[PDB]
């Protein structure tokens, strides 16, 4: 429809105001002494939470320009969350600082593109410096330490994470469900995991987790696109009679089929969840055959000849449980016979032996690795259901943090890592004065998280920041105890991956922002 | 949609205004001389009541921020009422005092987190001091005394409560009903009680009680989640033909099933109430088997093999009466044969004998206790139905107060308990000046209930407060007679549990309130 | 009345708006292709002028803050004009450029004091570089050249300035006069020249010149302050009877005496104008004695004993003509006998011989220099009275420019001198980033005059500026002919003194304004 365009520095200040609103809302909760923030609920009592993610997701502004600023900063922060598992608040704070300083500079007659280039140079130098300061977390002891730290200083969950870590190797799959007994139970069952996200958010049966947990679902294997729901009618009737959930893995799903399945989930006569086919091409077909072996199902392909209409319940695979992460899937305890899986593993091993291409060999090796390693299962054990839920959440976030730490490393948390790299990079110079100003903007903006944490603690931000910059190594300021020392010794730790991703995404969105003039919006009605 | 965000001290004063409105509305009715408050009725004459709970539930403001403050304070006060059985007004008054003083302090550049920590330390000290000041109420004479006091000084109801307490022991179940004759009737019939709340408030057939009373309902036992209503169709047809109510206990009930059953209750062709399955895992299954033994029903589980479609009226259990409390459920006079129940008791006793884990042993012991103790039955006795209703309500509240007193104890009521604790804790000091100020704020806020009671009585609040603080022990101010003396002597008593819970929840909501900066709401339209 | 105070960047932008208005108003006329600007007149037609000074003096704004900004910039520009004789427009343009860039940088969150220090360093380097680039104008040929150039390319006036310059030496005194005949005349008559300004602007009998020309005025010499007008009554009566203008040279004049003299001048009975006594102490008294020697007057001092009441017309001195400029005075052809003046010269020469102090020797030497050198008179010669006036104005401005050039030197005019200095100082660095930014601000602001001249010519400013910066030496852009070359060869020349003073005063006012935060004014009524 009709749109109104505002461009120039007026658009910039509008977007800055939107980002300021969102950044204040999020940064209030930063740090161990983070102040609570109350969220509206359409009905009943409002919630109260220190979680930055929820408050961030709840922010929408009235006037459109501020809304776009907040929405796009929020989207980049959510991308950072999905990348690692935390650091939305840090990313938003960094974005706010960089935006404020860079837009001030641009309003000061600064070349925005050179500012972007300088910020990019500064952030890549900071990233490599941070990698230099990373501490390995390969040993099981540090793994238990970080697991304990992430879950509010609980050693049992750290021990469980370390045990499962040992069970399923370095790059194993970890899943957690609610254990019946008071004792924690760890077991290894043959499972699956591939990086594919759900078709629509509406399949999420548990919105507070953002996943689709199904019990004993009948999986359907298809190498074809779901053009028409007529093909889905017989299997839909069969599963409706079976009265059990189901999974759909297919080459593609058309939009109308998606609307039909959304309707069939709102009705929920059938618990249907679909997801893109993993792999690609011949690799996709081979791994779909592997899934068929795991779940005892059968692949339905147009090229081979069989059609989805001629699909029985026996043709479908099955598994004890599946979970559809926002960008990943998990299969647990496939019904398929283990001997068949072992034979498939041997076949793919022979394919590896005869493999000559390097990347094809890598694909085959990771295929057999994820085929044979399986999925670990962690069962929470305590007395009361309330503690089932809270300890399950703690185990989930601790697992995310621990795997992030294992992937890259662990650096002194509390925001002091950014301060350390900033002090290390005090003499970084660009190609000219413009990029130099951009570099300085980035360097002084990387101090925002620690300053905000200290301000939330009620102490003086600048004094603490200067004292930390004076020190070297990992010597930072404990927010909780208000005592200086070494973060590694006192356990305040953050994964290298989360800090790196948050910093990079904040820099990316900030640089993208600094170089925008035109805005288009619908008329305010 | 678009959301208005207000953060800083303006959000604080908005929430303070909302809390002030709600607190005035509730505190007006506090005390024996509490002034009446008139409420709105969409049709007919307005209702006039001194009950703080109703007026509290009917308060919610126009502008959103004050509404949030009122709603969160109301929710916490209602949580206190559910936990104990009274003290909604006391909790609201304490919350108002603490919020006013704490926000007044925060406006002076005071560290909110230290204020919260000081308040928490002060309330913990107050709780332990109150426990020290508690008077045991284990003897039957004090039980009768508190029963008489709670029910507007009626000795007959106190005697009945004492008799039932003797019948079903210290932690027995007690239920109230309507007796045909003028004489009061007492009897013990095997029954159930477990802490589970209703799925939906819409199941409440008697909103003024907040419960679901059913006469001769057909109970259905399920260990599975109610995914589809097709499974519920045959049993629903059977019970529609039977023309009797029913109970539903299941592992879970999905939202679509909840909507379907809400529709089936609005039609009310079938009188249906659903509730979560108590226990957990194997313990859950074992107690579901116990329920089947009590009610003569049968557990329908996927794992065993049978399905809910093959549900006959014989398969369902039955009982003479059930009541679905907000967070509890009660079964009365299960049809099942007593010999089978005794055999199950013996089996669980053998399980206790062979039990090794202390927790499993405790679960088995409480299982046999709840299986064998049964449920007490108290039938109100008088002539007119008006007195049936009022005496039933009196028995209900007296039973609540008496069980609360038995659980923890009884302290001098009328608000002097908090005054005594405050006088005892006059020298409590925090880690610094900030926590000390928070401690003083809490201490002077604990005097609010007595001051409000005296103000309602029309006398000078501060004079009476000082006179009470001068005394020691339980000496206080009888508001009703306007005379001083030991409150225990003249029987102005409150349970220790209700005062402790009210104070603790007021402190918790105050700590949440003070540390709030950002508010997000929907735009006023 | 009350006063409105505005501080912060809002006052800065108010001043910026005022400076912008005044600056573009003045700069429209800059350059040989300067565009006309109309002015005000309460009666009759408005006046159209290309003179920056006339338009500048007329500008004042309606709102007080930007009015203060314009007023102070105008005052500093007028100071620049008085210092040398031109460069008001250049000073205003430089001030505008520096103010815009510096206030932009200050809005960029940059330390204003460091900006001021960097600008001061840059302008000092620019001044010394300009002195290095100066071309001497000692020889009579260059004197004639600059005289011709200043007076719109008229060789006769430059020639006349050359002969007068030779007559009265390098530091001589030149006065312009109206000549009866068409031939130009030159004569040397003993006269004074001391740097004192009029007591009041109201003495100005010819406002378009800003001077006080008196014909055959009597002179009253006094070493005392004029406390009371009673002392002035007898001499006032004597000069009123004489019907001739009066000149008052005295130690000081009190404010009420000034009001009395203003009233008398407005009455027109006496054409009196007063001036401060030059010198200091004994030196002042000695030069007053010298003035008495010239004019045949007598010094009336309290210490000697005589009083101003006992003053006859004989006691007063006399001269053929006097002119009182803004801060300058001229006495022409004192009546007193030349032999007495020569005797006084011999006395002061003996004092020089016996002088031991260096500065006293300098004072005596300059005193004999002004006593013996006298004053040259250049009588303009043409036919019509209109050309009398225009050629007299041309002679005035050419004399000012020529003496300015003789004092310091002559650098390539047309604004390219600043461009050359800026190109020479491209690598000047400050102590830190802020001073460096200020240096760059000044360096890029020195290009404003040439850019504005080119823009007034209608050509492309930046292209011409780049082309000039590419060249070295005095190579620049002729605005009139739109041809490049050497400014010296084509005669486009400006004195070193005027450019230096304009740049220095623009830098001074810019430094003062950049470091301004608060402003206090009267309420707008």
Residue numbers in the entry:
A (entry chain C), B (entry chain B), C (entry chain L): 2 to 526
From the primary publication:
Gro-EL is a ring-shaped E. coli chaperonin protein complex that helps mediate ATP-dependent polypeptide folding. Gro-EL forms a stacked heptamer formed by 14 subunits, with a molecular weight of ~812 kDa. Expression and purification of the AAA+ ATPase ATAD2B complex in E. coli resulted in GroEL contamination that co-purified with our target protein.
The NCCAT collected three Krios datasets: ATAD2B-apo (9,541 micrographs), ATAD2B-ADP (12,945 micrographs), and ATAD2B-γATP (10,880 micrographs)(step 3). The GroEL-apo dataset comprising 9,541 micrographs was also processed using CryoSPARC v.4.5.31. This class was used to generate a homogeneous map with D7 symmetry and was further classified into 5 classes. The final map generated from non-uniform refinement had a resolution of 3.7 Å according to the 0.143 FSC cutoff criteria. The high correlation coefficients for all three structures confirmed an excellent fit between the final atomic models and the experimental density maps.
